[PDB]
Amino acid sequence: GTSEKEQQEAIEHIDEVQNEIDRLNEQASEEILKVEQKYNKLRQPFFQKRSELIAKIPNFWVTTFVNHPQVSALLGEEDEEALHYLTRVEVTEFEDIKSGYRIDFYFDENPYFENKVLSKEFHLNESGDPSSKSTEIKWKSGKDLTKEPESFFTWFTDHSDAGADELGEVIKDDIWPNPLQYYLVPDM
């Protein structure tokens, strides 16, 4: 019962209404991002206290990883040995999501590599796509674990799809918020 002029006029009116819904969608997403930023700051003193407490627990992080259903699948026998030198893991999330997040792994002096810290960083590149970069591992002579599944440590050098990279997100979103559940094993 509407004329074709009335219909086109309604279509334009709907488009204007959609632009207004778009605006609210964006404002909502913005408020939500700020909430996450507020609470990332509120949790940080607690993660820092937890890091000091984990320093009291020998082999905390390798125990956590060996008991994790996804991470354990990536660890070979010699990788597990090397991870006994892992003293500290830190996850840092940047406010600007183009800056992404970083995972740092702190290692005591060990026979495999010279680095005191190994890190993998996740960010958006100039075209808006997920990318990653890492510390170059300075393996010691005859102890390159990357030279039979592939070593865990090839993760540091794997960048051909950060859009994916499940392991980074597992550490950021699962293990980092609560590693204690995986460290602890029921007694009998």
Positions that interact with Mg ion (CB under 5 A): 185, 187
Least distance between Ca ion and beta carbon 84 (Å): 19
Distances (CA, A) of 160 to 94, 99, 105, 122, 155: 22, 18, 21, 12, 11
d(CA 75, CA 67): 11
| 32/184 with CB nearer Ca ion | 184
Q: Which does 44 bind (CB under 5 to 8 A by kind): Ca ion, Mg ion, its own copies, none?
A: none
Helix (H, G, I), strand (E, B) or coil at 106: strand
Least distance between Mg ion and beta carbon 148 (Å): 31
Q: Are 100 and 123 in contact (CB under 8 A)?
A: yes
Q: Which does 164 bind (CB under 5 to 8 A by kind): Mg ion, Ca ion, its own copies, none?
A: none
Contact string 168-187 vs Ca ion (x = CB under 5 A): ----------------x---
| 117/184 with CB nearer Mg ion | 184
| 16/77 with CB nearer its own copies | 16
Number of residues that bind Ca ion (CB under 5 A): 1
d(CA 54, CA 69): 21
Phi and psi for 74 in degrees, rounded to 5? -90, -10
Distances (CA, A) of 177 to 34, 36, 90, 105, 154: 19, 14, 11, 16, 24
Q: Which does 70 bind (CB under 5 to 8 A by kind): its own copies, Ca ion, Mg ion, none?
A: none
Binding site for Ca ion (CB under 5 A): 184
